[PDB]
Design a protein around this nucleic acid. Structure first.
Ligand SMILES: Nc1ncnc2c1ncn2[C@@H]1O[C@H](COP(=O)(O)OP(=O)(O)O)[C@@H](O)[C@H]1O
Ligand SMILES: Nc1ncnc2c1ncn2[C@@H]1O[C@H](COP(=O)(O)OP(=O)(O)O)[C@@H](O)[C@H]1O
Ligand SMILES: Nc1ncnc2c1ncn2[C@@H]1O[C@H](COP(=O)(O)OP(=O)(O)O)[C@@H](O)[C@H]1O
Ligand SMILES: [Mg+2]
Ligand SMILES: [Mg+2]
Ligand SMILES: [Mg+2]
Lengths: 312, 48, 312, 312, 313, 309, 312
DNA sequence: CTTCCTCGAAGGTTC
DNA sequence: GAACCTTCGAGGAAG
């Protein structure tokens, strides 16, 4: 299936796999539950996938829920009561839980107990619920929103990293086998270079090319069909969209490469101020096409040659 | 007089009185021959 | 009914139809649903009609709702439970949906399951609902209005654009052929030129012209009849509406031609910013009446001469 | 009754009156129901009266309700279910009803059918219902604040406009004859000018002037009597009411003409800031007495001369 | 004349008092009831007392109730049925009435009768209730929240205003006759000036000055005793409290007039944000001493000249 | 006992104490009940204490409740029905009463009657002459129609060093601890002007004197105890000193933003703004500016730094 | 046990530990309950641990609850009603109590009584509930969130401070004896210097090193194993994480040390403004590697000599 | 009904 | 005077 099930299949993230393997094997020798682990990083790098791999490698059933599903403290208490010794609890989008509920985990994670109010409302008393040994797994796109006392309780932190071309190429080939399609090694590398280092984007591109190759082709993906499908998709050989090309062109044509202020550029490109800064600009800076300067952003030589203009 | 007796309760309920209290209020009127207008007027006039 | 039912009837949008034809035909060879498609662009271009065409081409039912109509997660779950295998769900103004609801779609779109808290009090428990295969079709004005986690899950993007005079003319002739009416090419072209490039506007104008020609004329639409009918309505000789007239009149007579802030303008014309941003400004800009600058909007000489003011 | 009953009797609104007559008689020639009509403009211009006329001209029963008067979908469903073929439904303040109610209206207007959700909790189904032929007539006060997808469903728009002096004088004369009062054409002209272009206001002042003429005068509304009565009522020769005079006077005497923020101004005069911005500023702005500025409201030179204060 | 009976005795409100007289006389000239009246103005100006005076001038009885006291249509209909021809119904805080009742009042005010519909719609009948001619007098502090259909039914608008020094001075002199104290006309003027234009505030000051005069003096309010009484109570000649002076002095002395944020200003005087924004700031704006700006509060030139500080633009 | 019982024992509050003495004597002279009194101001200045003194001076039994204890109109009506002629009702934390309850209090304070719907029917109850006393730290939260009905308003102000010195000596006699006059002044300087803070310091100094000394507070033991508590001769805590030191040494006196300052000292933003900063501004050590907060010349002199304009 | 039980075992916190000894000893001589104590400060410094120590030293039973559990006055009233003479009540996360509930503690802490409504209907009466001598202990990280009247009632305040290398070394050795681990003193100091001054972090590192030492080593922690284990975790000799090093390196190489804005720097490292500002920037500033100035972040000379660059 | 937070303004520095 | 960066203040909407 699409989602890798074991570390033998999970390509990439060598730094994270090398650590998780040691901690899992150490926990098994001691016959203990794994320490609480937090997975965080950019979108689509494989955080949710790794959560299922950790459960399969431990050889235990996984209980699953999500941050937005826990609306009140009463819901979380009901979930915790269902735990069995050695159970793994996975909370996706953990940063979405309200603070009033997040503070209930503090005691459960460190001392395996919870204070609760029980009674008829007219008469009641506090009681301690005792929890069995369990492991909490959390995944979040922005750990900064979690309170400092919560993050401090996670004993294992896994920061996901972007994939390189050699690793991302194998992901494309593996996915093609699931689709029973044949992909030439040159075509697999072409799709990888345009996937912006993200597996979800590589799978999305592959699916669109696969549909094209079997409707107007002999059902085979080669270095010739890829160019035609990628032309229809309008994804440059560097992964730039038409909007990205419009930006780089505008700076060179109307401003001679800058420096130009974002407000000025935004007007010529007809795009909303923050949309440029938060959606399109981040990738262009990381790839080296744009350089932020004290007087404004400047288009580097890499942008000139890629767009075909003459640099000075 | 079933028309006036029932019409009074029907209209009195439409004015927001609970069906139970509306039925009692109309039933409390001594004169059965009281017309729909008189029953509703007397019921409201007697409740304030 | 007027609404086209198949790609053979849908005029224009060549770049969109050509892509949908390939993906739909491929998705039919394999017994599976079409990938979630996102349609975006100016309002009234026919994106809602496209949702009906896809359903008829796929041979499945189409369920319709809107972003602002769904207020809480319980409302969305009720809709998703009602879907049948392969059904199409269309959500208008998806960008306007509450964040508490949007985060529920993430799991539904990627793995077809939802985690929900069911019951009450002592009966509260977590259930892992498994959804059948379905296709989501979303509509929005601009792609930058959606969050990165949501936009990453839509596998097909359809950018729609304004129709050209040749296409609108054929649409007017088609519409006028459904009704028992007769229109000469000059009138059809004149009526199209006045339709601000939007099919929805063209149909409404044709309906009113038909009523006029039956009472004030011989029941046949001719250039002279269309000119008088369009003159009786508030449509100017080049599609400017009374609201457009008010904007230019206020800009020149009070602000002296600008620059003026869109917010300060909106509150003076007594119109919501969303209407000017999404309805009036786009046409006035693309037709050269309004120029966008870092300082604000400025009226052009074309607008000055149209209204008849002294352009110094 | 005071309000007119037919187009031959309805004074003014020549543009709207001429437009509706054509479309109304055109529909009769085809023997079909009239298209959905939207009325908008300042309050008290006769929008409701026009609805009664349209129904009488069509010869259809008029059913009236209001947006705020509808609280739940079951209310609107019961109303619509009691409509006979050809009935006209008039709904005032259609722009203020709850968003959950508009969902039913979209389908009713687009296809004369509705879909009602049934069940609760684990049960979630719906029932489809079709509506007989009918015509919807909407009335609004801020067309710029109506829901865009709803506004696009209306096929006919009626822009009500302020009455001119030749028309208001006829209304005052008409009303004076119903009261059997004696008024000269010169006195009626003064009342019309100071009536702020609104028929409802003209009636309010005419009633009050009658009480004054019956005591301070011989029951005849002379110009000398009319002027003495209007000064007693505190109505400026330009129609500015007691509150309007207080606003302009405060700006000039306490803030030297501004700029002054709405909050400060609304606290100096004992009035709710929302009331000042929603009910009083619109007239002062249209007359050009107050100009909204980034730093606050400012009193124009016109206000200085009108109030009798020397401009800077 | 503390509780007047006719306009002849009611102190102040000359504008509204003069207008109402003409409409009542014109109504009496005909066999008709006075048009529905709506009274506007800030709270505590005497609106309730005015309604009673109108009833006497018309020669009819007054039925008093309030919006919050009306919960269902039956309540209003029952109240109306108790009225006699020409009686006046006074409804305070008319803006707080429930919408479910508002829709019923329209028919009563316009037609003097109410028709109630009963049945399944497939079969239905109506009951007609005739009401005696009556006059409705509404009193509300907030007008914008009144629905347009309801406001359209009201035919007379009366605006209340703050009492001027001469009128407010007479209230003090006459109120001093309820008590056994003698107050000099000059002393009464000093209290009226500091009464912020409200009768209830003028009564409060007089009560406090009385206690001082009969304990620290000879039981007579002379100019000398009044000056001392208005000194123990730290009330400025403009009616500014001790805390009011501290606010202005702080803005001028430490911030040069501002702009200054509410948070910053609150911590300087050691007060809560809610207290400065609701207790002290409202009157300072009415006197024109400070203005509210996007950047914060600012002291006007009028405050500089009052506190005795140099001002420069 | 700690709480004084009469005006002869209540030290300070000259403005409020002098006014209340006049009003109480005048009311007694006429055999009338005292007007409704509202006491408000900063915490620990003596609001609750004064409410009991008023009752003892008038010679009346005091009924006592609190805003949080009253949750429905039925609660207030039951309490009001218990009043006897001349009774005084004291409601602490009056700002917590629900709006539905405040509306009932208007009629009782001004009209002396309550209308109760109780087979549904209305019963009209007549209340005898009574005095309501309210106390709160946030009088601005009360409804505007309620404040207008209070006839006496007492605004509490901070105490001066001579008064706090007398209070410290008084409390020391209750604890039967001997303290010298100059030793008592050292605590008064640090009490930040609040009687409750003065008592807290005395309790903590007593504990030290009993374990580390002969059980007597003198000019020598006080200096040791105050050094252990680490309270500056101006009442600044260890964190308060750290704030001023950081602003002068790292930013040259500012302007510096609250965020930057909080992170540098490793403190929560809320704590700096709401717990420590308020006293520094009122004493004049810090000033808020459009660009940030700056350390004044008074801060340089106290910390011992060469002032550089 | 992991948590120290007596002052003999509680390492560090000299200032707080010394004061509490004097106050506890003095309270015992008078045979009375200890004054109310508030413990606050950074996370993981030993706040909760100290609460249990106080109860053991006083020789009384501890009653425990938490702020998030007390949601209404009825909950608190039921807890206080169960207090016996000399009992200690500990409320963790006391800052979460609703403001309306804190106002009930005002009279309880100062006068040991609360006012409660009793009876039915018109017979209901308010009555004082009298409480025996008790001590309230509160622990919180957000002390500034408590109301001013509540904080003024606590008679003892304890502000927690970070630990020094000698104490952290002793803590690591102690924790090493709880497990069956042998650790060389040289290696124990190596972990202490990297624990950022927090005991919880020092314990977390030991657990991760132990797992490695028994999977890739002979089950003993020595300088050789410690170096290899810390290298895998990528923790610098100063405690800087991998991302922390990436930040300092980028500022020194691309911006020459700055000044640089947070937004600009966040994009270069592919992180987000909130994660950098909340997780990484705080420690870098407090330790002196980064300096905040009006112009932007600047790298100090300490960062240059640490990373190995010339401080030109 | 309340807290959180985000939107808008402006002071200061630099080229 | 265009362009960045830091900081404060008043809204307004999601609990
Ligand atoms: N290509 C087309 N051919 C024929 N009719 C069209 C076409 N595009 C749009 N229309 C018609 O114009 C209107 C478009 O409405 P709709 O599709 O709802 O626009 P939107 O979805 O943008 O609101 C419909 O009446 C539809 O039948
Ligand atoms: N053209 C007109 N001719 C005669 N009377 C009018 C006219 N316009 C308005 N009026 C009068 O003013 C009132 C209008 O009320 P209505 O139609 O409900 O206004 P709106 O619907 O704008 O509130 C009626 O009393 C009516 O008699
Ligand atoms: N014209 C007046 N003459 C004498 N006393 C007045 C007058 N207006 C107000 N007052 C005094 O101030 C109070 C406020 O006026 P009132 O009509 O009761 O308004 P409200 O009902 O809002 O309190 C009155 O009860 C009375 O004590
Ligand atoms: Mg995921
Ligand atoms: Mg108190
Ligand atoms: Mg803890």
């Amino acid at each position: 299936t699409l989602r890798p099930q074991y570390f033998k299949e999970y390509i990439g993230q060598d730094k994270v796999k090398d650590q998780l393997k040691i901690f899992i094997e150490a926990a098994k020798l001691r016959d203990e539950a794994l320490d609480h682990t937090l997975l965080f990083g950019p979108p689509g790098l494989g955080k949710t996938t790794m959560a299922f791999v950790i459960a399969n490698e431990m050889g235990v059933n996984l209980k699953q829920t999500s941050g937005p599903a826990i609306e009140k403290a009463g819901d979380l208490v009901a979930i915790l009561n269902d735990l069995e010794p050695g159970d793994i609890l996975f909370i996706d989008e953990i940063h979405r839980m309200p603070m009033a509920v997040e503070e209930v985990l503090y005691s459960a994670m460190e001392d395996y107990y919870i204070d609760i109010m029980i009674g008829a409302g007219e008469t009641s008393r506090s009681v301690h619920l005792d929890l069995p040994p369990f492991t909490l797994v959390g995944a979040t796109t922005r750990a900064g929103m979690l309170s400092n006392p919560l993050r401090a309780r996670f004993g294992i932190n896994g920061h996901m990293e972007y994939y390189e071309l050699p690793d991302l190429t194998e992901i494309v080939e593996r996915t093609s086998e699931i689709f029973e399609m044949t992909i030439t090694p040159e075509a697999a590398l072409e799709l990888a270079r345009r996937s912006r280092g993200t597996p979800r984007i590589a799978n999305r591109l592959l699916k669109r090319v696969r549909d094209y190759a079997q409707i107007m082709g002999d059902g085979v993906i080669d270095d010739k069909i890829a160019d035609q499908a990628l032309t229809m998709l309008d994804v440059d050989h560097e992964g730039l969209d038409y909007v990205d090309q419009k930006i780089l062109r505008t700076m060179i044509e109307m401003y001679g490469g800058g420096p130009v202020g974002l407000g000025t550029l935004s007007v010529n490109i007809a795009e909303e101020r923050e949309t440029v800064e938060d959606m399109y600009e981040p990738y262009l800076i990381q790839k080296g096409f744009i350089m932020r300067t004290r007087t404004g952003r400047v288009a580097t030589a890499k942008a000139y040659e890629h767009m075909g203009y003459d640099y000075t | 007089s079933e028309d006036a007796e029932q019409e009074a309760v029907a209209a009195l309920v439409a004015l927001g009185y609970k069906p139970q209290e509306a039925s009692r209020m109309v039933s409390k009127i001594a004169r059965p021959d009281a017309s729909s207008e008189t029953l509703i007027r007397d019921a409201l006039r007697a409740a304030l």
